[PDB]
Write a protein that binds this ligand. Sequence first.
Ligand SMILES: Cc1cc(C)nc(SCC(=O)Nc2ncc(Cc3cccc4ccccc34)s2)n1
Ligand SMILES: [Cl-]
Ligand SMILES: [Zn+2]
Length: 295
Amino acid sequence: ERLLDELTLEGVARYMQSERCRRVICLVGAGISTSAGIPDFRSPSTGLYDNLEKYHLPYPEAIFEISYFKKHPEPFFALAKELYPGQFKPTICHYFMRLLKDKGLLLRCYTQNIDTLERIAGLEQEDLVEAHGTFYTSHCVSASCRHEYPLSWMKEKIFSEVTPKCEDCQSLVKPDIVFFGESLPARFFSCMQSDFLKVDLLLVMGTSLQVQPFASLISKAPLSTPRLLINKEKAGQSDPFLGGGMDFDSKKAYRDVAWLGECDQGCLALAELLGWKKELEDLVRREHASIDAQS
Ligand SMILES: Cc1cc(C)nc(SCC(=O)Nc2ncc(Cc3cccc4ccccc34)s2)n1
Ligand SMILES: [Cl-]
Ligand SMILES: [Zn+2]
């Protein structure tokens, strides 16, 4: 009775092009941006926080915490300068999502990433749930002010090593990323409650589904909704020690498919099956050319 004729990428592609699949939700994480030269910011093994000792922190995790930021914002802003990407070129995976949008198939992209590449690739605010926030906008932290500043303004402050202060009230201005101690945006919960009633396919790309509540999203899909993981490692299965998890491989598997490899290569393989490879190549090459040519 299952919706996929077989538990393979080919089965997913046939399902996507059938009349049964009209609304796709993408859940994406750091694995979709590594080929753009942006390392994973939740990983202690990616060499982003190896030299925090210059910042003289009371403990290493203080730099992620909101109360420490509001008291001592300088370490965060110096780290932001050190980690600021040298270019923002979205990957094949980002542009595959733009094609889903262009084809009328994209219900929503939920991202754990803060790098803004989804927006550069042409996903609009309405299409996006930035579950961990984003650098795309920043706000004055004073509750009576909340003046919004664009990334161009925040970048200038970061690179000139001037602690960003609100022009209206002189309070700190903070990028709209979710620090430890802050709540996830209300938009995440609002959109989840509606979108998961409407989803025909979950495309899970570049996330190991380990950080909550973003990981628990997969259990919100209807039981029939196929779920395709494109990721370097299998993820989302039930923990044998702790315990709607992914079932790729048992005799009871019926809807979950794992494609294990680089996110770009998986999206390229899917686009090829769909007949979209030329469209995707042309889109990526033209957008990359435009980005390379920024003068
Ligand atoms: C600086 C910058 C600007 C843009 C547009 N894009 C990027 S992507 C590269 C990168 O990994 N950056 C990073 N900046 C800060 C990082 C750690 C961090 C520390 C404290 C709180 C966090 C709260 C939430 C999330 C992270 C937080 S990682 N980075
Ligand atoms: Cl993760
Ligand atoms: Zn202000």
